[PDB]
Paper text:
The pyruvate dehydrogenase complex (PDC) is a central metabolic enzyme in all living cells composed majorly of E1, E2, and E3. The 2-oxoacid dehydrogenase complexes are a class of protein complexes with acyl-transferase activity in metabolism and amino acid synthesis. They co-localize 3 catalytic components (E1-3) that act in sequence upon a substrate-carrying lipoyl domain(LD) that is flexibly linked to E2. Like mammals, fungi also utilize E3BP to recruit E321,23–25. The cryo-EM reconstruction of the CBD from N.crassa E3BP inside the PDC core here reveals its oligomeric form and specific interactions.
To determine the interactions of the fungal E3BP:E2 subcomplex, their CBD and CTD respectively were recombinantly co-expressed and examined by cryo-EM. Tetrahedral symmetry was used for the preliminary reconstruction, and 3-fold symmetric sub-complexes were computationally isolated by symmetry expansion and signal subtraction. The final reconstruction to 3.2 Å utilized less than one CBD-trimer per well-aligned PDC core particle, and permits the CBD from N.crassa E3BP to be built de novo. The core fold of the N.crassa CBD consists of four helices and two flanking beta-strands, inherited from an ancestral CTD. The CBD of N.crassa has a trimeric interface with a symmetry axis that coincides with that of a core E2 CTD-trimer. The CBD trimer interface has evolved from the dimeric interface that core CTD trimers form to extend to larger assemblies. It is hydrophobic in nature, formed largely from the C-terminal end of the first CBD helix (residues L285, I289, and V291), as well as it’s C-terminus. The present reconstruction shows unambiguously that M2 is the major binding interface of the E2 core. A conserved Phe (N.crassa F324) appears crucial for binding, as predicted in C.thermophilum. Additionally, K266 from both participating CTD monomers interact with M2 residues N325 and Q326 from the CBD.
Numbering used by the authors:
A (entry chain F), B (entry chain M), C (entry chain J): 264 to 349, 392 to 425
D (entry chain H), H (entry chain K), I (entry chain L): 255 to 301, 313 to 320, 330 to 355, 370 to 380, 396 to 426, 438 to 458
E (entry chain G), F (entry chain B), G (entry chain A): 226 to 458
Amino acid sequence: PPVAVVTAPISLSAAIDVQNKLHKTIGVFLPLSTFITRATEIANQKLPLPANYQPTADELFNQVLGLDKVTRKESRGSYTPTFGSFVFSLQVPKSEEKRAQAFLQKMKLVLEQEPDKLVR
Amino acid sequence: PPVAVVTAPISLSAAIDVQNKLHKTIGVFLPLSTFITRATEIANQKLPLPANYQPTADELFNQVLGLDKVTRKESRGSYTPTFGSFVFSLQVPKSEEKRAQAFLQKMKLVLEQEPDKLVR
Amino acid sequence: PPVAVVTAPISLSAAIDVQNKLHKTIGVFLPLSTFITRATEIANQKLPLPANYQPTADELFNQVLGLDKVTRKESRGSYTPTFGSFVFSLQVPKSEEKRAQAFLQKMKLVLEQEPDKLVR
Amino acid sequence: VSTNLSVSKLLKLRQALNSSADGRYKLSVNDFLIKAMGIASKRVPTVFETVDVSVTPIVKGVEGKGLESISAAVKELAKKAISISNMGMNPALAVGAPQKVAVPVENEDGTTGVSWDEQIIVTVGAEWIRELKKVIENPLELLL
Amino acid sequence: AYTDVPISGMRKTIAARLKESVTENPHFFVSTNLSVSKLLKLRQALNSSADGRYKLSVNDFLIKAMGIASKRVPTVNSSWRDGVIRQFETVDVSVAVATPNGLITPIVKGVEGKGLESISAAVKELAKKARDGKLKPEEYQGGSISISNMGMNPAVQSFTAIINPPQAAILAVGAPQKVAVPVENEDGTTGVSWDEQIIVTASFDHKVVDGAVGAEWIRELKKVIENPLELLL
Amino acid sequence: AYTDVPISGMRKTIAARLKESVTENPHFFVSTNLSVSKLLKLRQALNSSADGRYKLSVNDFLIKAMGIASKRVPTVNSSWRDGVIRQFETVDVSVAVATPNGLITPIVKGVEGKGLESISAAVKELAKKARDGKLKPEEYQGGSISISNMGMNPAVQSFTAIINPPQAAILAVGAPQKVAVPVENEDGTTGVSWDEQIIVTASFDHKVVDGAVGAEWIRELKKVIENPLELLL
Amino acid sequence: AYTDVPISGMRKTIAARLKESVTENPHFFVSTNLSVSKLLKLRQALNSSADGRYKLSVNDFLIKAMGIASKRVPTVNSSWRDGVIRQFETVDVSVAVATPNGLITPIVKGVEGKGLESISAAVKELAKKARDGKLKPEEYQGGSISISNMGMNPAVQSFTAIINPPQAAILAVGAPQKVAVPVENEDGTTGVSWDEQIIVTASFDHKVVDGAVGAEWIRELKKVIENPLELLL
Amino acid sequence: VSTNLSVSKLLKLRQALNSSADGRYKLSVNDFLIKAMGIASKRVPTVFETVDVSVTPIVKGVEGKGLESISAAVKELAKKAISISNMGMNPALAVGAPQKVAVPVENEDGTTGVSWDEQIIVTVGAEWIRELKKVIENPLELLL
Amino acid sequence: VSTNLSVSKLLKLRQALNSSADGRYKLSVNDFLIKAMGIASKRVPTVFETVDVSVTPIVKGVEGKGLESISAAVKELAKKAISISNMGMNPALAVGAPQKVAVPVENEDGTTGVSWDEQIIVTVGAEWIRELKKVIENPLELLL
C-alpha cells in the first residue's frame, strides 16, 4: 500500500488580528484551535472523487431505473490536518492524494481572506 | 377553489442601521435575507386557526376521555413571503386568508421595533 | 425521608457590567436569567457520586468481564437553583446533600471570575 | 320533577362515532336517552324485569341492545306509522330544546372565569333522576 | 434408574378427546397484531371513576369484541353435526381456567346483550367455583367459541391451541410488547414513536370455515379493538 | 332455538379431500421476511412506460421468482406416487381464486420460459372464466406448486395453508407492513430508516422434502426477490 | 415427459416413522424471542483467553440452558409408554446432523453435570463419525429432548419441527436478526437502540404436557439465556 | 438499412449484474442483442413460430430462455468449433464497434449543453429495426 | 507451599449473582474454592476419578455440580453436626483472612500509580497451586 504526502504553507496573522480586536471590544477571548476546526468543517463539504471510484449496488440500480439520471461528482469527508506554520501537511494513499489537496487549498483560501466569516 | 391575496407595506431602515453598525465594530457583514428568514421563523409560532376547522379521531377521542379537556386555539405553520418594499404580499385560499394576516402583522411589528433581537 | 438544605451567598455585579457594556457596543440586551441557566448547564457536567451508591446489573457484568476495568467517579445531574442574593439555596435529601454542594460552589466560582465565558 | 343536563360531551361522542362510518347509520340525542332510561329504570325498579319504551310505537329489549339496533327500529316504525316525548325540533318524560348558560371555570392562574356550557331541561323519583343524570354527564358509563 | 407413576383416570378422558380432535378437524391458523394503547387509556379512565363496585380487565373487552365480530360474520358461530350444519343466533364463549387438578372450561352466556360488569362478575364467580371444585356439569358442556390468554407471563409472545370437539374455532392471546412506528411530525418529517402491541392467533376448521371468512373475522375484531368506542354499537 | 341447513353435495367433495390430505401428508412450516421496496419501484417504472397494453402486480413477480427457485432446487418440483417418486422438468403453478360458489384452482403453464405480460393475461382470463362459471375440467387438474395471497386485507399478517393431495409444497403470502432498520449514515453514526416488508410462509411435506432443502428454497426465493434485476437470468 | 426413480429402502423407514408420529402425538407450538448480545460478549471473552485448546459456539450454551430448564421443570423430561408414564432424572439431548445420505441423531449424555468444553468435544467427535459413516446403533437410540438449529442460513427466520416417536418435546432455533428497542437516556428522554434477537420455537405433545408447563419451560430458558452468568448455578 | 443505437444504459445494467455474482458467469453485448432479436422478430413475424439464431453454430429457443442459458450455449459451441455477425473486437445483421458522439442536454438552468453518449451503428424492415431499437435504448423491456 | 490470591473480581461476581435472586440462596467464598479445588485436582490427578471434599462432613460429586447444590449441602450438613479449612471469620488446604496491598497500575498517561488490591494467603504441588490460582484470578473459567 504506497502512501504519499501533500503540504502547503500558511500565514495566521489575520486570525491573530481578529482575536485581539474581539478581545478589546467585548471581552471574548478564544484560542486558534476553534478557528482551525471550524475551517476544517466548512472545508469538508464539496470535494471531488477519485478517478478510480467503484459504485455500489443501490447506485447502479437507481441509475438503470431512472430516478437519479444525473450522477454525482462530490462527496463529503473526514480529514484532520497536522500542526505547523512558517507547514500544513497531510499523509494519505495515492488514490485520494489529489482529493486531499482540494481540502488544503480550500482551507488555505478561507483562512486568509475570510477570517471574519468564522465568527458566530 | 377561490383564492385571495393580502398585502402590507414595510420599512427596512432599521435593519440597514444594525447591519452597518455591526460591520463597523466587529467586522461581521450579513445580508438582509437572514433577517427575513429569522423573522419568518419567530413569526410562525402562535397563529390562530380557521373558524371552519374539523378535528381528527385522536383529538375527539382524547377530549371524550378527559386528558386534554382544555382545547387548543393555536397551531404552527410554514409560510414564505414575497419580496418587495416601498410591498409584502401573500396569496392563500379564503379559509386561511385571515390566519395568513396574523403572520404579516407579527413580522411587520418585530422587524420595525426589535431588529436587535435577531442577533445571536 | 429526612431532608436538608444547603446555602451560599452570591454577588451579581460582574454580570451587570457585562450586560451594560454589551448594550453600549452592539445593541444586544439580554436578561440575567440566561446567565443563570447557562451557568447551570456548564455546572451539571462533573459532580461526584454519593458514597452509598449501589450499581446495576450491566455495570457489574461489564466489570466481571473486563471492558470497563477502570470504574467511574462522576455522573451528570439535573438541578435547578432557588432565586435570591445579598442567597442561593437548594433543598435535597441527606444522601446527595454533599453532591448538591459541589454544584453550588462550581456555579459560585464560574459566575464571579468568568462572566465573559457565557457569551457566544 | 325538573332537572338540567349538560350535553356537551355527549355531542362530541356523537360526532366521533358519526365520522368513522361510511354511510351506514347516523345517531341522535333521542337514541342515547332511550338507552340511559333503561339503565336508571333498572337501578330503581319501582318505576317487571324487561324494559319497554314507547316513542305510539314500541321498542323492545333496550337493555340487551346497542345504538345501531335501537336507531333502526325507531326509524322503521316511524315510517310505517314507560313513555318518552321530545320537542327539541322547535327552539321555542318530556325533553325540551337546547340552550347556552354561563358557568364558572377555575382557571389555573387562580381566579374564576366564564365558560359557555350547553344545557337541556328535562321534566324514588329523585333517585331515578340522579341515576339518569349520572349517565348523561358521564357518557362512558353507557357501556356497563 | 427411573420412576413410574400409574396413569390417572382423568388423564385418559382428555387424552382420547385430544386425539379425536386432531384426526376429526383439519386445522389452519391466522395471525394478527393489535394496538391496545387506547384500550388501556379507556380502562384507566373507567377504573378510577368507580368507588369499589367493580374492576375491569382486557379479557372482558376482548370477549365483547369477539361477540360483535361473531355477530357481523355468523358463519363462524356454527357447528358440524352428523349430516347437517348447525347455525346459532346467540353467542356463548368458553374461557379456560387452570388449576393444579387440571384445566376447566367455565361458560358465559348472553354476551351480545350484556355489559362489562356482568361479564367480569360471572367470570370471577365461575373462576372461584372452579378453583374450589364445586362446579355443576351443565355449566361446562358447550359453547360456540373458545378463548385462551397467557398475558400473565411476559415470556410468551405467541402460541397455538387445539380446537374443542363440537366447536369450529378457537382464539389464543399473547403477552404485550413494544415496537417502533412512524409518526409524521408537524414540522414535515418522520419520527419514531413507541407503540404497545399484542399478537393474536386464531385456529379454524376448514370444513365449516374458509380462509376469506377467517380473514374477515380477524378484520372485524381488529377494527373493534383499535377503535374502542365502537364497542357501544 | 336454532336452524339447520342440509349439507351441500359439493361440500363433502372438499371435506373428504381435506381430511385425506392431513392424514396422508405430514406437514412442517418455514417462515421468512422479504423487503419489497425495490420491487415496487421497478413495478412503478414499468407501469408508466406503457400506453394501456398491460398492467402488472406483485403476484406475477412472485410466480416468476418461484419458477426460478424451483429450477435451482428441483427436489421440490416432485410428487409421491404409489411406489415411485416422480420428478418433473416443467414448472406449473396453481393460483387460488375465491368466488361465492367456492374456491377454484386455475393453472398457469410454462412459467419458466415466459414473461410477466403473458402470465398476467393468463391469470386474468382464467380468473374471469372462473368467476363466470364456464371452466373446463382439464384446466384445474394438476400442478407442482400452489400459491395463495391475502394482501388485499391489511389485517392478515401471516397465515397457514393446507397442501393439495398430489403436490408436495404450498406458499402463503401475507400483507405488507412497515418496520425500522439501521442505516449507517455517512457522518459515521447509525440512524433509523423505515422499510416495507412482507412475511411469507411455506408448508412442506417431509416424505419428499427435508428441512435443509426447504431452507435453501427459501434462500433462493429471497435472493431473487430482494434483488429484482436477477429476474432476467 | 418425466422421469421416475425407485424409492430407497431407507426412505420408507423414515416415511413410516414420520407418518406414525403425526397420528400418535397431538402437537401444539409455543414461540419466544431471546436477546443474545450478552451471550455473544461472553463467548468472545472466553474464546480469546485460550491458546488453542477449544472453541465454543451458541449451541453449547443453548444445550446447557436447556438442561437447567429441564431440571427446574421435570414434567417435560418424561415419556409416554403403553400404560404408564416414565419420568427420568438425567438429561440426554439429541442433536441433528445433516449429511447427503440423510439426517442422523447423535446423542450427548450427562449434560446437567458437565461443562461447555466436553459438550463441544463430544458434539464434534460425533459429528465427524456421523459424516464418515461409522456410527454404532446404540449411540443414536433414545433421549429426552431434541434440538434443531438453522442459524447458518440468514433466510430462515422461524420454522417448525416434528417430534420424535418416544419423546415429548422438540426445540427449533432460527437465525439472528436486528430490531429497535427503547432506551431511557440519562438526559430524561427515550431513544432508539439496536438489539440482536433470535426467535425460538418449541413443539410439545398435549398428552404429557400442558400449556402452562410449556410456558414456564420457555420462561426458565429465557431467564437463563438473557442473564448468562446464571449458567454457573 | 442502417441505424444508430445508444448503449450506455445497457453497459450499466451489465455492470450491475456482473458484480452480484461470485464467479458463476459473465455477460456481454452479443447476448443482449440475441434476446432482443427474438422479441423484434416476435412482433414482426414476416422476417415459423420458433426463433433460431446462427452465430456457423446454432442457438435454439431464445424466446423461452434467459441470459444465463444463452451465454453458456454460445461459449460451449464456440469451443467445439436468422444470422448475426459482430466485429466489435477491432475498434477500426452486422454489428460495428462503439464510438462517442456529442448530444444536446437540456440543463435545468434553461440552456443547452454538451454531453458525451456512446453509440454503435447496426446494419416491414423499418418496423423490425424500430422494435429492436426500442428494446435497446429502454433495456427493462427485455423481461416481458 | 504458600501463595497469594487476588479475589476482587470474585467478590464482584458474588455480588452480581446475589442480587438477581429473590431470597432463594446466598453464596460465599468457600463455595467457590471447593469447586475450583475439583478443577485443580482434575488437571493434576496425582494429588481416583471422583472428587470428595471434607469440610468433618463430606460433599460428593463436586465436578458434576453447581454452586446452588454445593451451598445447600454445606449448610444442611453443618446444622446436623481431600480436606479444606477456613479461618476467614477472624481478621486476626488452609485459608486465611483478607487484607489490602498496594500494586502498580500502568496509567494511560505513561507513568506508574498506586492501586489497592484485596488479597488472601493460601497454605506436582506447584502445578496444583498454579491451576487453582488460574481459576481464582480469572473466575469465568469455572464454567468449563
